[PDB]
Symmetry: none
Subunit: 50 residues, 4 copies
């Protein structure tokens, strides 16, 4: 029903934004992770080149 649906909306939007905030932290954490793995590979190549 009308009000029952809106309550779903209110709950959802609060929930979605939590997901978007989580994802940003994830997406930014993933880049940091990727960059860090890149340093790790650069190191393996240095051990190889010496």
């Amino acid at each position: 029903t009308q009000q029952e649906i809106f309550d779903k909306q209110r709950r959802l939007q609060e929930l979605s934004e939590k997901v978007r905030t989580a994802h940003q932290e994830i997406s930014a954490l993933r880049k940091a992770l990727q960059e860090k793995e890149a340093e790790m590979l650069q190191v393996l190549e240095d051990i190889q080149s010496i």
Copy 2:
């Protein structure tokens, strides 16, 4: 096939120093993904909450 000791010693020196950078990479990698594990679990948990409304 004729390196001598000192050049060998220096090999071990560089090999060791890079072995430490590897440990450092392992630690930093190991912590970054654990962190990543946890924010993904938090987002997935919220996905559950959404699904159950």
Copy 3:
């Protein structure tokens, strides 16, 4: 006739798929990190 039940079912699939992918990723990362331990301890 608001049907977010279609969304609920879509979200459920996403949670499922994201979760398996993420677990596959974690295991392959652990494989990789184990080889680093091997490299470090050699």
Copy 4:
């Protein structure tokens, strides 16, 4: 020994190779995961 080093250097190349293939696999799985996370958001964004 120089052979002990050349061995403890060839073993590292082998192991580094394992890291690199595993990292390529990780890279593809991460890209898969990314697309799935973004495709999910495309669902949550459908408030219209």
